[PDB]
Design a protein around this ligand. Structure first.
Ligand code: CLA
Ligand code: CLA
Ligand code: CLA
Ligand code: CLA
Ligand code: CLA
Ligand code: CLA
Ligand code: CLA
Ligand SMILES: CCCCCCCCCCCCCCCC(=O)OC[C@H](COP(=O)(O)OC[C@@H](O)CO)OC(=O)CCCCCCCCCCCCCCC
Ligand SMILES: CC1=C(/C=C/C(C)=C/C=C/C(C)=C/C=C/C=C(C)/C=C/C=C(C)/C=C/C2=C(C)CCCC2(C)C)C(C)(C)CCC1
Ligand SMILES: CC1=C(\C=C/C(C)=C/C=C/C(C)=C/C=C/C=C(C)/C=C/C=C(C)/C=C/C2=C(C)CCCC2(C)C)C(C)(C)CCC1
Ligand SMILES: CC1=C(C/C=C(\C)CCC[C@H](C)CCC[C@H](C)CCCC(C)C)C(=O)c2ccccc2C1=O
Ligand code: SF4
Ligand code: SF4
Lengths: 80, 156, 64, 143, 73, 740, 73, 65
């Protein structure tokens, strides 16, 4: 499916996982930020590429990046 | 409550309507050759092709380019209908080669259980036999529609 | 202690940031040793609408 | 969570009429999704693909075609009645997959029990140019 | 003659559009800034905003006054 | 139960909120950091739903908004009356309506505009108007410009009163929510009171004022010696000679001898041959019957005295088995949502405006209006477009209600819930019938185009070749022509001359003549049906899928007007209901453009023309029968055979129409920039321009930003509609003035 | 009139050059999106975030430039 | 009895290879017959020719051909 990557600029506001209506992102413990949290994407193959996490990302530039390509039956949002 | 889904489950799409819950509609659809599971695909193909090749001769004869020419409108219309029947037969063969290169894994799950193991229509050689029946029915219906314009008590 | 003075104007040299070669005001510098401890506030919003961003020690300098 | 729960086919379903928005042929040939929640009383909720339905007092079962429908229903339930539900994935061969609460504490929490995946320790924009990864099969962000 | 001129002019326009498109493809796909540092290409990319802004200025000025005189007449 | 609940002084009257432009929204109350703040300021200005969540404040806001719109309309009407009083040739037009073109706008001699003051006759120069105001001021008895001056001053006074009423009813004494929720009282007072009282007042004005003035006007009497209407009102002797029923003096009314009033309350079919409009006695009896029918209708609902109808009881009582609960929660929906009421009222207002356009091209209700082809064409086209715009807005505000004011707890198995439940079936069947109509309405045109281009006219779908005769429309025409013979024996003639057999003509020009319907009319009517079916498909799909969809199940939480949900699922651009309406504006534009093209060509080819002693000659020589079967024939014989006067209007009185034509071409073409393009390219170009302004320190404090995607779509559709409407307006008006 | 239509021709050439040059120079990076080089030459958009990023790629710059080329020719 | 006649009708063309070959042979045979022998017997107006029509062209003078 698509490729979702999270960079070290994330500060653990844990709102990118709320804006994603597909449970692609998850919050793991970290040590590189004050909140001690980092976005991770275990269920990346379930992503469609709606870029709602990029909308919800407050960092400049975006800590979570979604790259389109290699569409599938789950990445195309198909119920048929 | 006339409006309800089929078998009391709402999670499905299609729901049971008096258009579909009418006994006349249900027995008419079940007795159609396409839904006759106990018949060979070539026989239902023969019936379907006969009906469709009989109906296809009409518009070509009546509204053809040579419809004003007496005696040649019917011939041209019927051979164009036969050509259209051959085109549809080629489409049927291509669909049979396409959609049945794999194997189905589940049945149709008819009402109140009792499902047949596998519909012979939904196989590759079964759909090939269905296309063969369809084209045989198509040219036979076209030829019958031609001679129905050859002997006539009215119009054509 | 390890970064610029709080409230002092700094210049952001981060290329991918919206505020590249711009001036921002430091609001807090983290002392726990994180990746981007310097927190600055800009008077002009970005396209996302935010006005604050975090940068490393090497991405901030005193403007002339 | 503490123990992974298996869905029960014996749980009832909310009262709902026939809606054209719902399961399709993809629920047969491919996988489909099942959502389960426990309710204290009979309330009225809006289906993500249909109209309004009345949930039952107790366990509930909803079959939805996509995972996005299941998470939209989950977010609606959590925002409205703080339901905290969970949804599954049932394949065509009968395999049941657990999707939403893998740790049982939702993606908003951390639980200190999940590893980092698809995380780059470099900054965004520090990626190499596509010329540096040309004819390699790896994208600059995949490094 | 009219058909020949129109044909080769439209062909030329499409080919120039393809030239600029494939130059853009060069810039994104296989352009290595560390390979040619400080050369004409990197310097042109450095003040790209000036080139784009001046092209916008001359286009806006030409369109403004050309439409103004056409509407005036 | 029904009472006047009013809160006194809720809002102080001061300019504190005038100083800060962003005050209605908390998001816009901070400041304009970006340039999109201004567009959000002018966009969320009247959106009262997100300003506050209280329905009472919203109701007061929309009440004073309607008051302000009423004041604006009264100001505009008073201005039109003032223009008729001061800069007009109305006195000259009254003495010669068949030879003097109407004029009510006079331009200044400042720069080259003296050529726009065309020689309209009567020793007057000015813009040849097209609103038909002279015909209206001849229908209502109006002789001198003094009466127009008085009407203008009264309209200005009422506009000031309406603005003061809005100020008072908001800032000073604002009604409560229960005052607005008295739906039965509102319906009774706007059925018996507004509509019925206005119909009775207009019937009385027509009986006592308009009937004698119009009876003396078409008799050859000069308007100078025509007695003033107060003389008819006060003296029964003057009104008795024109109408002998006035000698009885209200005796037949109270004695049920209404047949004695058959001289000025007549029941006649057709038009007055002297003027070409409807008989004023027929209009008087019409408005009197309308007043009676609305006065009885306004005493239906129960408000305070026990008797009457309860609307909630009526809705909850109509329940039929294939619909589950029937109209169960619609009363609560329409008493708590302003947007659902707005959708219903806008749909019915638009449809009734369409009815107005059709029924005034068919039966001209004004003297010397049918012969004035420009006024009739302009009125038909204008009310065509207003009705279409109102219908599209009805779809938009229905979608807004669907997104915002809809709650699934109130309605479970009602009609609305079942409509959402089977929305896929509705949309699929509508798509099927749309495609079927498109094929068997446009492929016929393409096929006729081909066989014309293939040199085979005998294979056409035309009258000379094999034909599709509109048998149902012709049968209805024959039934309505023979309706006064059997089914309406008291009617003097047919209700209109669309299906008649007589050709009325005033001043040597055909007022209205029978319309023949053929294969081309069948093709164009089915094209109209196709276009309306596709437009209603788009609008209903936008309304139905506004809440949720199989693509985006959480579309309700994204709001009504959002650009997209990102490039996911292949790209969900234009997925909001707002963008469905945005496409609906274009489709209504196409539908109404084809409709008004059909109207103009059909009138100019088969109705409008100059009558001669040897037959009747039309404006165009009957080209609609033999040229409207093909798209190329439509093009060459309508858009190229006409519009030769628009291009050749330079140096004449209609040169401004050519200027308007080319400016409309510009605005229509300029819209496609905002329609094809996106935002990222324009944002990057704006970034380059910001760098340019940064180099020499002329950077604005407000950061320049590109227009939003919804903002860009709105600008594109607005410029497209403005360009197309003004293009058709200029072409139609120049063609109908230079020829008709 | 020849000189005026020549200036219209120059306007069309200048505007097509402006858009093609801006698409080429911003093909790999922009202030709205610094990482355009990682998304390929022909990608649809970046989403509704950051104000809206429709037609942000250099491919869409070429696509809009073909209209101006057609108008110029 | 009715099914047997059509069963033997289909058995020679039951394979998709056989039916593809049959439809190809009939299509090329019919298309080759058309024009060569299909036209000029139906009096198709493509194989007839003009009487004396459309030699000159150009209404603005020059009178080519
Ligand atoms: C024929 C229609 C039309 C017109 C007139 C324009 C005009 C313009 N486009 Mg273009 N464009 C069009 C169609 C059109 N476009 C289409 C169909 C597309 C394909 C999507 C594009 C794609 C496109 C791109 C991709 C770009 C342009 C750009 C431009 C500008 C070029 C600068 C110029 O020539 O000076 C100005 C030209 C004018 C004609 C001036 C118009 C303004 C006049 C003076 C009226 C101003 C208002 C007037 C005083 C009345 C005030 C009241 C009123 C506002 C209510 C200009 C604004 C470029 C741009 O904006 O960057 C500089 C650019 O990058 N356009
Ligand atoms: C709303 C519409 C309307 C109005 C205003 C009028 C008005 C009039 N009609 Mg008409 N009429 C109408 C509709 C209308 N009509 C319709 C629909 C028909 C059916 C076709 C007729 C048929 C008709 C006929 C056949 C005749 C009239 C006549 C009249 C006049 C006599 C008044 C009368 O009989 O009652 C007045 C009786 C009243 C009890 C009204 C009382 C009102 C007064 C002014 C109250 C004042 C109280 C005040 C507060 C105290 C003094 C104030 C002081 C300080 C100044 C009058 C000008 C007659 C006419 O022309 O005579 C000259 C006549 O012969 N009418
Ligand atoms: C000889 C010159 C030349 C060469 C070698 C290439 C070669 C290439 N270009 Mg380039 N290009 C050229 C000319 C050239 N192009 C011109 C003239 C234009 C302007 C129109 C472009 C615009 C262009 C863009 C914008 C892009 C490329 C891309 C590509 C690559 C793949 C394109 C391809 O084959 O897809 C095969 C494409 C098709 C089979 C589609 C054909 C449909 C055509 C184009 C539409 C024609 C309209 C109509 C249907 C024609 C029939 C009419 C009908 C009535 C019969 C390849 C590196 C792409 C790339 O590098 O990928 C990132 C890319 O993004 N080029
Ligand atoms: C018989 C009494 C009566 C009459 C005639 C009207 C008339 C009207 N009302 Mg209604 N209304 C009434 C009772 C009445 N109302 C009651 C009892 C309620 C409460 C249940 C409402 C609640 C109500 C709402 C909520 C709204 C209206 C609106 C309107 C206007 C609709 C616009 C239109 O059709 O253009 C017709 C336009 C004209 C004829 C122009 C002249 C307008 C004159 C000045 C109004 C005079 C009528 C008035 C009732 C006289 C008494 C007022 C007095 C205190 C001075 C119209 C003027 C709308 C509005 O705000 O517009 C004002 C609106 O949104 N009405
Ligand atoms: C009965 C009439 C009526 C009423 C009371 C409303 C009321 C409302 N509508 Mg609706 N609407 C209507 C008719 C109506 N509308 C019609 C007929 C249409 C079809 C075009 C629409 C289409 C529509 C949409 C698509 C939307 C609304 C929205 C709204 C809300 C805010 C509107 C606003 O702030 O605009 C602000 C006012 C302006 C922007 C000024 C209008 C200027 C336009 C764009 C150009 C006009 C140009 C003019 C014709 C010619 C000038 C030429 C120029 C050179 C000078 C409000 C609830 C919006 C909303 O959020 O709803 C909750 C929304 O999204 N409406
Ligand atoms: C005149 C320009 C035009 C045309 C022809 C179309 C055509 C179409 N649009 Mg579109 N539309 C347009 C502009 C246009 N669009 C624009 C500019 C917009 C933006 C606002 C839209 C917005 C829009 C929406 C929002 C919707 C459509 C829909 C449709 C479809 C209507 C189907 C139908 O009934 O027509 C019949 C089909 C035609 C007229 C196509 C031409 C067929 C001709 C007659 C040839 C017949 C077939 C031919 C013989 C086969 C040739 C074979 C050959 C390959 C060998 C169709 C695909 C609707 C849809 O999906 O279907 C209902 C829909 O919902 N369009
Ligand atoms: C023009 C095409 C065509 C061709 C090449 C054939 C050729 C053949 N068919 Mg056939 N058939 C045709 C048309 C054709 N038929 C038609 C129009 C019908 C009526 C629907 C039939 C019905 C038919 C049946 C029922 C049977 C044949 C059989 C046969 C074979 C023996 C010939 C015979 O008995 O004729 C007749 C031979 C392979 C028989 C066969 O294959 O025997 C094993 C057989 O059982 N055909
Ligand atoms: C073309 C569109 C066909 C729609 C067919 C279904 C209509 C919707 C439908 O099923 O309505 C069901 C309705 C009967 O249901 P009830 O009488 O219980 O509903 C009445 C209450 O809504 C009041 O029958 C009709 O409307 C018949 C006319 C259809 C035209
Ligand atoms: C001899 C003579 C003369 C002279 C002339 C001249 C001197 C000319 C020149 C000319 C020129 C001088 C021209 C030019 C042109 C150019 C162009 C046309 C360009 C284009 C470009 C492009 C297209 C680009 C691309 C790209 C990109 C985008 C990026 C990177 C890569 C590349 C580079 C590929 C005179 C007049 C004195 C006189 C007569 C004779
Ligand atoms: C157009 C216009 C105008 C003008 C004019 C007018 C409008 C006037 C007036 C009018 C009026 C002023 C009206 C009304 C009248 C009255 C009425 C309509 C009445 C009624 C009545 C009824 C309905 C009833 C009665 C009765 C009986 C029958 C018996 C006894 C009892 C009773 C009393 C109940 C103005 C400027 C204003 C404004 C703008 C527009
Ligand atoms: C052109 C364009 C822009 C750029 C347009 C912008 C930023 C709006 C510009 C509005 C101007 C500033 C209004 C004023 C115009 C003149 C200055 C008025 C002159 C008046 C005279 C009297 C001087 C977009 O932002 C956009 C966004 C989404 C889709 C398409 C497009 C799009 O096509
Ligand atoms: S693009 Fe959408 S589905 Fe994918 S990780 Fe981001 S928010 Fe979730
Ligand atoms: S091109 Fe624009 S409208 Fe379409 S999915 Fe991308 S950001 Fe949204």
């Amino acid at each position: 499916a698509h490729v979702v990557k999270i960079y070290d600029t994330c500060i653990g506001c844990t709102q990118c996982v709320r804006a994603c209506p597909l449970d692609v992102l998850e919050m793991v413990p970290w040590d590189g930020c004050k909140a001690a949290q980092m976005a991770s994407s275990p269920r990346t193959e379930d992503c469609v590429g709606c870029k709602r996490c990029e909308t919800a990302c407050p960092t400049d530039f975006l800590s979570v990046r979604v790259y389109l390509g290699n569409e599938s039956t789950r990445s195309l949002g198909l119920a048929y | 409550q006339v409006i309800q889904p089929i078998n009391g489950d709402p999670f499905v799409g299609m729901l049971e309507t008096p258009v579909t819950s009418a006994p006349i509609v249900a027995n008419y659809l079940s007795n159609l050759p396409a839904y006759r599971t106990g018949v060979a695909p070539n026989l239902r193909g023969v019936e379907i092709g006969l009906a469709h090749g009989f109906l296809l001769a009409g518009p070509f004869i009546k509204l053809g380019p040579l419809r004003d020419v007496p005696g040649t409108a019917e011939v041209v219309g019927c051979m164009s209908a036969a050509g259209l029947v051959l085109i549809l037969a080629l489409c049927l063969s291509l669909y049979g080669n396409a959609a049945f290169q794999n194997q189905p894994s589940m049945g149709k799950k008819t009402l109140s259980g009792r499902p047949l193991p596998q519909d012979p229509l939904m196989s590759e050689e079964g759909w090939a036999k269905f296309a063969a029946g369809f084209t045989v029915g198509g040219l036979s219906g076209v030829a019958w529609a031609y001679i129905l314009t050859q002997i006539l008590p009215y119009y054509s | 202690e390890i970064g610029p003075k709080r409230g002092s104007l700094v210049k952001v040299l981060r290329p991918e940031s919206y505020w590249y070669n711009q001036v921002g005001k430091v609001v807090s510098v983290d002392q726990s040793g994180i990746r981007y401890p310097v927190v600055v506030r800009f008077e002009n919003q970005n396209y996302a609408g935010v006005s604050t961003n975090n940068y490393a020690l090497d991405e901030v300098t005193d403007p002339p | 969570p503490w123990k992974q729960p298996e869905l029960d086919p014996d749980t009832p379903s909310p009262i709902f009429g026939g809606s054209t928005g719902g399961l399709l042929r993809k629920a047969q040939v491919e996988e489909f999704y099942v959502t389960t929640w426990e309710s204290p009383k009979e309330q009225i909720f809006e289906m993500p693909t249909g109209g309004a339905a009345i949930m039952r007092k107790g366990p509930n079962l909803l079959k939805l075609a996509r995972k996005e429908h299941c998470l939209a229903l989950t977010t609606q339930l959590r925002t409205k009645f703080r339901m905290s539900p969970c949804f599954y994935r049932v394949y065509a061969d009968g395999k049941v997959e657990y999707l939403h609460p893998k740790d049982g504490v939702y993606p908003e929490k951390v639980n200190a029990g999940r590893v980092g995946v698809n995380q780059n320790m470099r900054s965004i924009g520090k990626n190499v140019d596509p010329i540096k990864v040309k004819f390699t099969g790896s994208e600059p962000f995949e490094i | 003659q009219a058909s020949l001129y129109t044909h080769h002019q439209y062909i030329a326009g499409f080919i120039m559009c393809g030239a600029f498109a494939h130059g853009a493809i060069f810039f994104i796909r296989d352009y290595d800034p560390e390979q040619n540092k400080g050369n004409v290409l990197a310097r042109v990319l450095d003040h790209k905003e000036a080139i784009i802004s001046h092209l916008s200025w001359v286009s806006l000025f030409l369109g403004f006054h050309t439409l103004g005189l056409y509407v005036h007449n | 139960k029904v009472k006047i609940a009013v809160d006194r002084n809720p809002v102080e009257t001061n300019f504190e909120k005038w100083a800060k432009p962003g005050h209605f929204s908390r998001a816009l109350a901070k400041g304009p950091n970006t340039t999109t703040w201004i567009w959000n300021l002018h966009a969320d200005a009247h959106d009262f739903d997100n300003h506050t969540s209280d329905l009472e404040e919203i109701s007061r806001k929309v009440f004073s908004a309607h008051f302000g719109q009423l004041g604006i309309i009264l100001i505009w009407l008073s201005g039109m009356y003032f223009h008729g009083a001061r800069f007009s040739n109305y006195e000259g037009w009254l003495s010669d309506p068949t030879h003097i073109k109407p004029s009510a706008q006079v331009v200044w001699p400042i720069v080259g505009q003296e050529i726009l003051n065309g020689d309209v006759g009567g020793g007057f120069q000015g813009i040849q108007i097209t609103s038909g105001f002279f015909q209206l001021w001849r229908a209502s008895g109006i002789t001198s410009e003094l009466q127009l001056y008085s009407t203008a001053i009264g309209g200005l006074v009422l506009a000031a009163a309406c603005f003061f009423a809005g100020w008072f009813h908001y800032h000073k004494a604002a009604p409560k929510l229960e005052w607005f929720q008295n739906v039965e009282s509102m319906l009774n007072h706007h059925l018996a009171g507004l509509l019925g009282l206005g119909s009775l007042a207009w019937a009385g004005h027509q009986i006592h004022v308009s009937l004698p003035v119009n009876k003396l006007l078409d008799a050859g009497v000069d308007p100078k010696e025509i007695p003033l209407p107060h003389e008819f009102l006060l003296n029964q002797s003057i009104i008795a000679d024109l109408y002998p029923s006035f000698s009885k003096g209200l005796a037949p009314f109270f004695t049920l001898n209404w047949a004695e009033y058959s001289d000025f309350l007549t029941f006649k079919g057709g038009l007055n041959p002297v003027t070409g409009g409807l008989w004023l006695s027929d209009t008087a009896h019409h408005h009197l019957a309308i007043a009676v029918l609305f006065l009885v209708a306004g005493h239906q609902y129960r408000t305070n005295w026990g008797i009457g109808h309860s609307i909630k009881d009526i809705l909850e009582s109509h329940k039929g088995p294939f619909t589950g609960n029937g109209h169960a929660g619609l009363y609560e929906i329409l008493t708590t949502s302003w947007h659902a009421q707005l959708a219903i009222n806008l749909a019915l207002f638009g449809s009734l405006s369409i009815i107005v356009a059709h029924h005034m091209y068919a039966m001209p209700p004004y003297p010397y209006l049918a012969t004035d082809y420009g006024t009739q064409l302009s009125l038909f086209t204008h009310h065509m477009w207003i009705g279409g715009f109102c219908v599209v807005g009805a779809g938009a505000h229905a979608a807004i209600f669907m997104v915002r004011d809809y709650d699934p707890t109130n309605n479970y198995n009602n009609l609305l819930d079942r409509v959402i439940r089977h929305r896929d079936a509705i949309i699929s069947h509508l798509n099927w019938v749309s495609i079927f109509l498109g094929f068997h309405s446009f492929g016929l045109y393409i096929h006729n185009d081909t066989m014309s281009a293939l040199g085979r006219p005998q294979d056409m779908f035309s009258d000379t070749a094999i034909q599709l005769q509109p048998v149902f429309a012709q049968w209805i025409q024959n039934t309505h022509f023979t309706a006064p013979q059997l089914t309406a024996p008291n009617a003097l003639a047919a209700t209109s001359l669309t299906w008649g057999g007589d050709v009325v003509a005033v001043g040597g020009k055909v007022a209205m003549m029978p319309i023949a319907l053929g294969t081309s009319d069948f093709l164009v009517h089915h094209i109209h049906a196709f276009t309306i079916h596709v437009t209603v498909l788009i609008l209903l799909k936008g309304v139905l899928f506004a809440r949720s969809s199989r693509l985006i199940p959480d579309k309700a939480n994204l709001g009504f007007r959002f650009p997209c949900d990102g490039p996911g699922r292949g790209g969900t651009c234009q997925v909001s209901a707002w963008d469905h309406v945005f496409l609906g504006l274009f489709w209504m534009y196409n539908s109404l453009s084809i409709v008004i093209f059909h109207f103009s060509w059909k009138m100019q080819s088969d109705v409008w023309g100059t009558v001669t002693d040897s037959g009747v000659s039309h404006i165009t020589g009957g080209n609609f029968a033999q040229s409207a079967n093909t798209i190329n024939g439509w093009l060459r014989d309508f858009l190229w055979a006409q519009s030769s006067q628009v291009i050749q209007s330079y140096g004449s009185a209609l040169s401004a129409y050519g200027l308007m034509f080319l400016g409309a071409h510009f605005v229509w073409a300029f819209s496609l920039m905002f329609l094809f393009s996106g935002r990222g390219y324009w944002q990057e170009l704006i970034e380059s321009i910001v760098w340019a302004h940064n180099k020499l320190r002329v950077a604005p404090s407000i950061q320049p930003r590109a227009l939003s995607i919804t903002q860009g779509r709105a600008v594109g559709v607005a410029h497209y509609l403005l360009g197309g409407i003004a293009t058709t307006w200029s072409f139609f008006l120049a063609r109908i003035i230079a020829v008709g | 009139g020849d000189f005026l239509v020549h200036h219209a021709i120059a306007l069309g050439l200048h505007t097509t050059t402006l858009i093609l040059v801006k698409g080429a120079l911003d093909a790999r990076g922009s202030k709205l999106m610094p990482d355009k080089k990682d998304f390929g030459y022909s990608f649809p958009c970046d989403g509704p975030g950051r104000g809206g990023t429709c037609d942000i790629s250099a491919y869409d710059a070429f696509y809009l430039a073909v209209f101006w080329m057609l108008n110029t020719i | 009895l009715q099914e047997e006649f059509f069963q033997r009708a289909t058995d020679a063309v039951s394979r998709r290879e056989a039916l593809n070959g049959f439809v190809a042979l009939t299509g090329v045979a019919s298309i080759a017959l058309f024009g060569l022998k299909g036209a000029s017997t139906l009096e198709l107006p493509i194989t007839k020719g003009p009487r004396m029509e459309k030699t000159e062209n150009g209404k603005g003078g020059i009178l080519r051909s």
